[PDB]
Amino acid sequence: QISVRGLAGVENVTELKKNFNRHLHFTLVKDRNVATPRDYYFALAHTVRDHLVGRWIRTQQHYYEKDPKRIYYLSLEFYMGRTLQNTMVNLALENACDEATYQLGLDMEELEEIEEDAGLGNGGLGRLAACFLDSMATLGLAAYGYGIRYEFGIFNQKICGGWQMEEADDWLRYGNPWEKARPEFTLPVHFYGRVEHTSQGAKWVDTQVVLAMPYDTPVPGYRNNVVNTMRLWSAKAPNDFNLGYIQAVLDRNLAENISRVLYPNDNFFEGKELRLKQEYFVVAATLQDIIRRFKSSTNFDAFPDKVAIQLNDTHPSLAIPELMRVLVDLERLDWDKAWEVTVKTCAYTNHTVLPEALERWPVHLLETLLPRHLQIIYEINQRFLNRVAAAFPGDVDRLRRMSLVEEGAVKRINMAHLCIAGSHAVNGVARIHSEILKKTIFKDFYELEPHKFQNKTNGITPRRWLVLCNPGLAEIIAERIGEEYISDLDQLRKLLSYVDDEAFIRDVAKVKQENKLKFAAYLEREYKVHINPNSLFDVQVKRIHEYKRQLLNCLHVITLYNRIKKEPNKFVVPRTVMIGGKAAPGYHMAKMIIKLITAIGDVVNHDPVVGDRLRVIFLENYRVSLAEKVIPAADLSEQISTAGTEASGTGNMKFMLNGALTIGTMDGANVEMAEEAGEENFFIFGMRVEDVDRLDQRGYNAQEYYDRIPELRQIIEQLSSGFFSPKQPDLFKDIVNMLMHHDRFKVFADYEEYVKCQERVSALYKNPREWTRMVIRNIATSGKFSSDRTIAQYAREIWGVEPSRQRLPA
Amino acid sequence: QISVRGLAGVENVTELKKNFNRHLHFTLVKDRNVATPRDYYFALAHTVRDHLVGRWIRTQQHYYEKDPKRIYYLSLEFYMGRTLQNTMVNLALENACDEATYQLGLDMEELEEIEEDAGLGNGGLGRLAACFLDSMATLGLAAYGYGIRYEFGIFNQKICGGWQMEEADDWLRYGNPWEKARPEFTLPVHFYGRVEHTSQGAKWVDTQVVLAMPYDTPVPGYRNNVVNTMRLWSAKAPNDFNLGYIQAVLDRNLAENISRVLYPNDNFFEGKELRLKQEYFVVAATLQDIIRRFKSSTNFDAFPDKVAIQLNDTHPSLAIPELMRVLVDLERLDWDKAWEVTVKTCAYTNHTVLPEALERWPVHLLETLLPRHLQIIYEINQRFLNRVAAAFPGDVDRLRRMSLVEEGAVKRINMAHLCIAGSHAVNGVARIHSEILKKTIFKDFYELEPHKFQNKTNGITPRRWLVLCNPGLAEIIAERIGEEYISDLDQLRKLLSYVDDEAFIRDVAKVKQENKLKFAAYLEREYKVHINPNSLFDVQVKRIHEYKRQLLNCLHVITLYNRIKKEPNKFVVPRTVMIGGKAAPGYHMAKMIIKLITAIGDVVNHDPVVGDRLRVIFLENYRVSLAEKVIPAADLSEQISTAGTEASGTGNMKFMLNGALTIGTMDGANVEMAEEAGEENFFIFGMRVEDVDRLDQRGYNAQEYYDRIPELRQIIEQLSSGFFSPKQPDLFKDIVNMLMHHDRFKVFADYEEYVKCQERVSALYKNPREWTRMVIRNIATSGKFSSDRTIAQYAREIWGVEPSRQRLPA
Ligand SMILES: O=C(/N=C1/NC(=O)[C@]2(O[C@H](CO)[C@@H](O)[C@H](O)[C@H]2O)S1)c1ccccc1
Ligand SMILES: O=C(/N=C1/NC(=O)[C@]2(O[C@H](CO)[C@@H](O)[C@H](O)[C@H]2O)S1)c1ccccc1
Ligand SMILES: *Cc1c(COP(=O)(O)O)cnc(C)c1O
Numbered sequence A, B: 001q002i003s004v005r006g007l008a009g010v011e012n013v014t015e016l017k018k019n020f021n022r023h024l025h026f027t028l029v030k031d032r033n034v035a036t037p038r039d040y041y042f043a044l045a046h047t048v049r050d051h052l053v054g055r056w057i058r059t060q061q062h063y064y065e066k067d068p069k070r071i072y073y074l075s076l077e078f079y080m081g082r083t084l085q086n087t088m089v090n091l092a093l094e095n096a097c098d099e100a101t102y103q104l105g106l107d108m109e110e111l112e113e114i115e116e117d118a119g120l121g122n123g124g125l126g127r128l129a130a131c132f133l134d135s136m137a138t139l140g141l142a143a144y145g146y147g148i149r150y151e152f153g154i155f156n157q158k159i160c161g162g163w164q165m166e167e168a169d170d171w172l173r174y175g176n177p178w179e180k181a182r183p184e185f186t187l188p189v190h191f192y193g194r195v196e197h198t199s200q201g202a203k204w205v206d207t208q209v210v211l212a213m214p215y216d217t218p219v220p221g222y223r224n225n226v227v228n229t230m231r232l233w234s235a236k237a238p239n240d241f242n243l244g245y246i247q248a249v250l251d252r253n254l255a256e257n258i259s260r261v262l263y264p265n266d267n268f269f270e271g272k273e274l275r276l277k278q279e280y281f282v283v284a285a286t287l288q289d290i291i292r293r294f295k296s297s298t299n300f301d302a303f304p305d306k307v308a309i310q311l312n313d314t315h316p317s318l319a320i321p322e323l324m325r326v327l328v329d330l331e332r333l334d335w336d337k338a339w340e341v342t343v344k345t346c347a348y349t350n351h352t353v354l355p356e357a358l359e360r361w362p363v364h365l366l367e368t369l370l371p372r373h374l375q376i377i378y379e380i381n382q383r384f385l386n387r388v389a390a391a392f393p394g395d396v397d398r399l400r401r402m403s404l405v406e407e408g409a410v411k412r413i414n415m416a417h418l419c420i421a422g423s424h425a426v427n428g429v430a431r432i433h434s435e436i437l438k439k440t441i442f443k444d445f446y447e448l449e450p451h452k453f454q455n456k457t458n459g460i461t462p463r464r465w466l467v468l469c470n471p472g473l474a475e476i477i478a479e480r481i482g483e484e485y486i487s488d489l490d491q492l493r494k495l496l497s498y499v500d501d502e503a504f505i506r507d508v509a510k511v512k513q514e515n516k517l518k519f520a521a522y523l524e525r526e527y528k529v530h531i532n533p534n535s536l537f538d539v540q541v542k543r544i545h546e547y548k549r550q551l552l553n554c555l556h557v558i559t560l561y562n563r564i565k566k567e568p569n570k571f572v573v574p575r576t577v578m579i580g581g582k583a584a585p586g587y588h589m590a591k592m593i594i595k596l597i598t599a600i601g602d603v604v605n606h607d608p609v610v611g612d613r614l615r616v617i618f619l620e621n622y623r624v625s626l627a628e629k630v631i632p633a634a635d636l637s638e639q640i641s642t643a644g645t646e647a648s649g650t651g652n653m654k655f656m657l658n659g660a661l662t663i664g665t666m667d668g669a670n671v672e673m674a675e676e677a678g679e680e681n682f683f684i685f686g687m688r689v690e691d692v693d694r695l696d697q698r699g700y701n702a703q704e705y706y707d708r709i710p711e712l713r714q715i716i717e718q719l720s721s722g723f724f725s726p727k728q729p730d731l732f733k734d735i736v737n738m739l740m741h742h743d744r745f746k747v748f749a750d751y752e753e754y755v756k757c758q759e760r761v762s763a764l765y766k767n768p769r770e771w772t773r774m775v776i777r778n779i780a781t782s783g784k785f786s787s788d789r790t791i792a793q794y795a796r797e798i799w800g801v802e803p804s805r806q807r808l809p810a
């Protein structure tokens, strides 16, 4: 149908049709009479999968022959979403499969909706890993993603009576056609036990064993015939485990619980034993696999030349002491040589400065679970602190500040400190964040080892986040500048020479209108909710958190509503305000915020005087597949975190690429987005980092804002008095109390500027032509935020490998 | 190579080779360089599976169109063993696959050894279900096996220091290529809750729900293109189950434990809640599936015309009250009509008279778990006892004897009584057993309803138990009488006219010698144990149980050893005595018997004076795949249960078919085997049922035998004094105490006759020609013991359907 979706050749369509029928018959054991719509999805999935296999085998044998330096990306989260469409896009099969399925009397888009999201992540951190895998494959790097195959991913969110309810995401129910179990590479992982000191060295004995069974999932690069591997480990009990008889077999579940469920917390450290087991499990299995692959190319001097290990935050930080353990205890290297190898192999990425997110493990837990690792951590700490003491003699407070061991009521290991000590590179994920690391939380470490600290601004893959989710936009762009931009996103700059092109302006606006109509329909079909597609689509989708300030958006919404009620016959630009995202199950305030949003919707959406001028919708079960639908439909992107709290953000980049304008604070990557597009083409408001610091020095007093802003006072009085909860007048008392007395994120301080900035948004939306021209200026300068750029920088500046767009033979 | 294994045509071999390479590439994602031997097995398995699919689909659509009466065989056990070779045999692909794999540089028999047994049964009861499925398919019946897909089957037995150790049988580790998950037919199963009485009727409310997910496995008939289905249910928690968050997800394991593990008991009732849950789980899911299929052909008068339900013992007896529940509570039929339908639909097979095997469920368990079923059982009991009272007025003791409810310290439901009341047919599994049922434990029921009681003598499938495991014998038979006997085993009678044929005698003996050499090699390879292949192979393989009297065999072995030690320079016929079988994990005496057998081996096998004249080997991990190896190798079959205890036996029939002579008591099917072959061609010894009864009336005094038999006294003194356990002199004190004071199975009473009979065995073995002629007379009269005969009888006399050998189109 459209060019960017590839050719629909006669032979390929014919071959796809017969392979589809082959899988329906032989693989699914059905015929067309009893075939369910899900059967048709699986037949298509297997058919597309067949086209991956040759390239997958060829890629991996190519790496075996050439023996390039291997990149190992260790993460507890990989938020992959759906795989079918992405695979077709990257193999240039989308039009062929569409034609083939159409000829068999099936709608391919309907089949695509049957696939479950692989929701093995919470949000930005997990999705970044996913985008990164795509870019590493597209850039021809010998890269492997290593993680845990959770039986249950992020929970499905149901809204009941305006409240979040969680239900288990049983994503493997119907099977996963994309993965291949590799039981032959099953490896043992040890827990508990004790350390014995022999004449030869330390030995870790009397351990409990859990098996790690790998499942491999293909990661196709964009039309370069590269197919890399994501290897996810599943926990298995050994056959002699606990070996009355029946109970012993049933107790195998204990060992296998390690890979059962993803911890559902975003930017929050929960110091539970099961989480620690997961962290060691992935690290121990992965490192054995790495070393096996290295040996099968004795001399570990070359280890850092052939291996790079990227730690996705501190979650896999045990790789550092585990690598030391293997090198010292098993391979019998001397400490100093092992440490050199470890440091040169490992690099660490920090993703947040929020103090509640930092991993600080109780010593007593490590003592019991990983006794040898604790000993190694103590030794690392002693040698590291000796270096600090020699560099800064007499500075005893520096020693205690930099220690891996935090003293106190309960002693804890600071895993960030461990990572910095044991890595040759430490990076933040946006320029402002990386500077904050050097000036605040890692200041001492930067002073000791400045060369170690880098920036790598985050990015998103333009395959999933433009071509896949917004084919209409990708097409009208391709008509002007060709298709090269899909793997070279900087070429979008060529679109600046079309900002005054009348045809292009009309096409850009038409694509957005189409996306909005399609999404408005989706809302009525799958959720029976009615919206005006001519309204400004005002969207905030991301995890629910105080720092992200969904509450500030809520205050604006209520302000708009109150202004309409005061002057009902005055014209206002119609808006559909959409907010979506999951709250961590134990995060009370986040759950209260969800309830507030739905309660506002209940009032606003049923007020006859408002009409269809203001609608407030909570988007249920926000996830990657929903992001692919809503982001192309958005006019306005809400990126309104308190300055200094959002390390980067990546949703911001997705919206910019898809033709939404951004209202936001100078936080995370918003700073660089504004710099790229020009501040005149961004709706910037609010305190800068420096303003937040000044307010903190003086003391944040929310009462002052309440006293001086009448519109704000009215809203707080409405909340307190039960205007939005008639039958439960005190329902939102916790929210009001927090805002007035314990608001860490200064919602009131940015309220006035936010509301004024929102008026400037509405003003511009009244002039479609100039709105669209500003949009073109955003899309045109979004190139920097391709994860291809990000990964090229990791490759050159951290891993020491050169990327390549050279294709492998098909 | 050999005729009975089918044609190896050029096209078929070519097509098999390319499909093998296709699966290796696309399905296993490997090439020949990194392909493990297990990968080659799976490629072959998938290739063979492809040839099943067309026939499977065609068979099931044929049943949908013709709408025959459907046979539903409900069992908690299906002991299937391996599937690859059986599938090839039944599809006539064995030679083609052998040729194809040979041309690819692979040994097919080596690949066959990689397949795990599907060990979803304990022994005879489970294996009978397996043989039955094969015969139902071969006889063209629209039959479905329904059971539980246990994650763990019967444990693997390891012998450590002469003791049984159990390890989990993780049979699904590498995947199961034969099964197809059918998540689309997932059904809810209810537990706990309470009964509410409305104006409309009873309602079962506030229940906990577990989901039953079916997996379908194909069951091919012998070269008739029929492929039937075995549907096994797996337990799944619903997604809202227990919905802190993490613990709620982890607690899903509780619900899913229902299908986790097979209860490892043979002929023993263990009244545990988990077992009761398994029993209801299979029944509830199956009945919904049956009713669904019946409705999709309102009026339940025709239900018994279109449905037969065969209860494999009382384990699925809850089908009776469940069917009543559905018909009365949900379909709103009046009680009397529902009962008529239920009785005409259900038939019950009893498999043992051992009192410890009979299911008697505590009322308090049923009360809590299945409150509505208990109410229905009470109502059934009241109406049944009213009939008894009208038939036998004043006979109050009969009423209490026949009651479904047993009064006492704990009230119990007798499930056998429930089954008799609610079935139109009740059968035993061998003539002597069925007569014992009518004379003893079901005497009262036979007097009330004599027409209900039948015999169906057990059988074995000649596909697995001759053609598959003993191709050499099948071939030399086929050379004389053709191949028709494989699905018409009575034709083996034609072999009687070859009993004086010199070529046939030599061929029969040569095949046995080959089998013995092959098995002797297997012992050295996989277990590094050395044996004389010229010795008489004396084999007792079956579950370890007191009633089976492995101990009596032990006494004979020690007698032989003692006689050799007394007269070392006298000639004796050399023997290799092989005993194998698993003990139930909680069965102390059975575990002591295993230890005794190994302890005897330790003494006998290392005594220089014995030499290679006597060897005692314990065959570790006896299972279906091992039976397929050892049974063809055997000369003498030990079937030596105390008269009246082995309901039928089926191992006995396997040995008869494979050219072993039988030493045995007149118990179970041994009686009919002797009758078929002629008593002169069987080594019959010991008490008959009537002799056991006379001894019981008088009182069994083991001391009397000890006092009057010096050779027996010597053995008991050896056991007691520590001759077979030097470092642990009192190790076998429990065994001696049991034999002398608490022997339910009268081991000493048959000792003298057993030993004398064993001398007659040795005497005949000295004359190879006459030994072989007696063997021919056994093989020739083994036809009655084909499960095809058994199933034809069930079909005509119980289910009301006609079997057929007519082929379906390929
Ligand atoms: O740091 C955590 N989660 C994050 N989630 C994110 O989205 C963060 O990483 C993204 C990718 O770098 C950033 O864009 C985002 O700003 C940051 O909050 S960091 C975290 C911390 C502890 C446990 C689980 C997750
Ligand atoms: O009856 C049980 N087991 C049996 N196992 C057998 O092998 C029996 O059935 C066979 C098939 O009919 C008979 O050949 C055998 O004699 C009998 O013991 S009965 C049983 C009883 C309770 C729980 C589990 C199993
Ligand atoms: C991109 C993405 C995120 C991250 O969004 P932010 O606005 O940067 O927090 C979270 N969830 C999903 C499903 C995403 O696709």
Ligand SMILES: *Cc1c(COP(=O)(O)O)cnc(C)c1O
Binding pocket: B122, B123, B124, B127, B541, B542, B543, B622, B623, B624, B627, B648, B649, B650, B651, B652, B654
């Ligand atoms: C046939 C068979 C049995 C039953 O043997 P009996 O001697 O009748 O108890 C038990 N186990 C296996 C593995 C079998 O094949």
